[PDB]
Amino acid sequence: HHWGYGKHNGPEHWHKDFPIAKGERQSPVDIDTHTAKYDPSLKPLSVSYDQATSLRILNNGHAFNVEFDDSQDKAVLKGGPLDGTYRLIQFHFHWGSLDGQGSEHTVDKKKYAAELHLVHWNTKYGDFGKAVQQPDGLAVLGIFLKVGSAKPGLQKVVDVLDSIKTKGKSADFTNFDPRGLLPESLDYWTYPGSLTTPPLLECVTWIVLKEPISVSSEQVLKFRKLNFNGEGEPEELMVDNWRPAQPLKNRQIKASFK
């Protein structure tokens, strides 16, 4: 497959190789704050990242992934809408060419400069590859980024990007604490959806935090110096690696907060 975010291979083309692109529970979606309903049935969200073991950072030609050791319950997401235990495997971002676009989810049609995805898999399915074949296999924690003051906890990520400029490059990325990327509040919206890239599998419980984190213009400018292309190839800046909002269809977005 040769999918990407250009005119010629971008989200409007994905359905030809990945027909689920036009499915009943695609992501992202616009979060209409006036139709999402507070759900008193939601349990408190539990983000347990104290024992998180980061390993590596990889430019995959679509975004960059910070990968974790998920061979045991070291960094887990529980509670909120989730049944059981979901293990952190990686995080990555989606971002724009300019500060007015870049997020995948929108909030009353507002686009943020970027969106962080912390990807977790349901440990009752034993491995990530099995989990993505299940409707409750993954929980992705989505966090909006706006441009304002620097996020200190992001700087170690920003500073290694020079070493993974092009597709296929990786770097050692140990001892990175993903707690440094969370906002103060864990208030969230939740809905059933999909991976937002091919293969667009409908296996995700989305948990999207209401409170954005602030990052500096300098921090997001360094995201925009990455390349989609491999070393030696014509430079295509890694920008606008976001899928637009997809039809909500027969889904309800629930709020954790009044």
Ligand X SMILES: CC(=O)/C(=C/c1ccccc1)C(=O)Nc1ccc(S(N)(=O)=O)cc1
Residue 153 binding result from ligand X, Zn ion, none, given CB thresholds of 5 to 8 Å by partner type: none
Q: CA–CA separation, 60 vs 170, rounded Å? A: 9
Is 117 marked within a binding site? yes
Residue pair 86/206 in contact (Cβ under 8 Å)? The answer is no
Give the one residue of 23, 79, 148, 199 binding ligand X; rule: CB under 6 A: 199
* Interface stretch with Zn ion, choices 70-78, 117-125, 163-171, 212-220 (CB under 5 A): 117-125
Among 119, 141, 161, 245, binds ligand X (CB under 6 A): 119
Decide: is 105 part of the binding site for Zn ion (CB under 5 A): no
Specify the 3-state DSSP secondary structure of 189.
strand
The DSSP call for residue 155 is H
| Residue 77, beta-bridge partner list | 47, 86
Asked if residue 189 lies in contact with residue 180, where contact means CB atoms within 8 angstroms, the answer is: no
Q: How far is the CB of 63 from Zn ion (least distance, A)?
A: 7
Q: Which of 57, 77, 114, 140 binds ligand X (CB under 6 A)?
A: 140
Cβ contact 247:30 at 8 Å:
no
Work out the number of other CB atoms within 10 angstroms of the CB of residue 60.
16
Within 53-82, the residues that bind ligand X by CB under 6 A are 60, 65
* Of 4-12, 39-47, 111-119, 230-238: span binding Zn ion (CB under 5 A): 111-119
Stretch that binds ligand X, among 3-11, 38-46, 80-88, 193-201 (CB under 6 A): 193-201
Interatomic CA distance for residues 102 and 243, integer angstroms: 9
Is 62 among the catalytic positions?
A: yes
Burial (Cβ within 10 Å: 0-12, 13-18, ≥19) of residue 87 = buried
105 is in an annotated binding site: no
Opening angle at CA 96, ends 91 and 100, nearest 5: 120
Which tokens in the block code for residue 18? 């990945």
Nearer to Zn ion, 23 or 39 (CB): 23
Residues found near Zn ion in the complex (CB under 5 A): 117
The binding site for Zn(2+) consists of 92, 94, 117
Active site amino acids: 62
Residues found near ligand X in the complex (CB under 6 A): 60, 65, 117, 119, 132, 140, 195-197, 199, 201
